[PDB]
């Protein structure tokens, strides 16, 4: 359902490009900013470069009137290092479960990543802002 939703905002706060890769929603839809009825393909974001101080926004929700939520993953990768993984990201805003999940994994000590805004207890996962910086 549309009540299961997440907004992921990637903000590059450093001086080196970061890149989005392997964006895949396993449950639900990706949709346009502020319009859950406008479903969009992950190719609108796949491989996109986020330049210094730029931002990129992904919106995902459950499908309308579906007893199912939104679940997906994506990578941030380093376009100056052979698209080496920076971090791996997983989101889940389930239907009928009170625990939402936002999990960052992987390791790359040249990069630092900070996120906030998530809601883990009941309802939608919320609007998560992810700051990236190459050290």
User: Given the structure tokens 């905002």, which residue do they identify?
Assistant: 9
Q: Which is nearer to Na ion, 79 or 126 (CB)?
A: 126
Residue 19 · residue 60 · CB < 8 Å: no
CB atoms < 10 A from the CB of 30, how many? 21
Q: Is 59 a residue that touches Na ion (CB under 5 A)?
A: no
Segment 68-127, which members bind Na ion (CB under 5 A)? 93
Which of 1, 4, 7, 60 touches Na ion by CB under 5 A? 4
Whichever of 15 and 26 has its CB closer to Na ion, that residue is: 26
At residue 11, φ and ψ (nearest 5 deg) are -120, 120
Strand partners, 87: 76
**Nearest distance in Å: CB 123, Na ion:** 6
Looking at beta carbons only, is 71 or 132 nearer to Na ion? Answer: 71
Q: Minimum CB separation from Na ion for residue 37, in Å?
A: 19
Query: Residue 18: in which H helix or E strand, if any?
Result: strand 18-27
Residues that bind Na ion (CB under 5 A): 4, 93
């Amino acid at each position: 359902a549309y009540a299961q939703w997440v907004i992921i905002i990637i903000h590059n706060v450093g001086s080196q490009d970061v890149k989005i890769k392997n964006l895949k929603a396993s449950w639900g839809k990706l949709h346009a900013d502020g319009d859950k009825d406008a479903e969009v393909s992950a190719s609108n974001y796949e491989g996109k470069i986020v330049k210094p101080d730029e931002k990129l926004q992904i919106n995902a929700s459950g499908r309308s009137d579906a007893a199912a939520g939104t679940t997906g993953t994506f990578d941030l990768v380093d376009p100056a290092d052979g698209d080496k993984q920076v971090r791996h990201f997983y989101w889940d805003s389930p239907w009928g479960s009170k625990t939402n999940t936002w999990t960052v994994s992987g390791s790359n000590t040249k990069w630092m990543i900070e996120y906030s805004g998530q809601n883990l207890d009941s309802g939608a996962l919320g609007t998560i802002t992810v700051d990236t910086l190459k050290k």
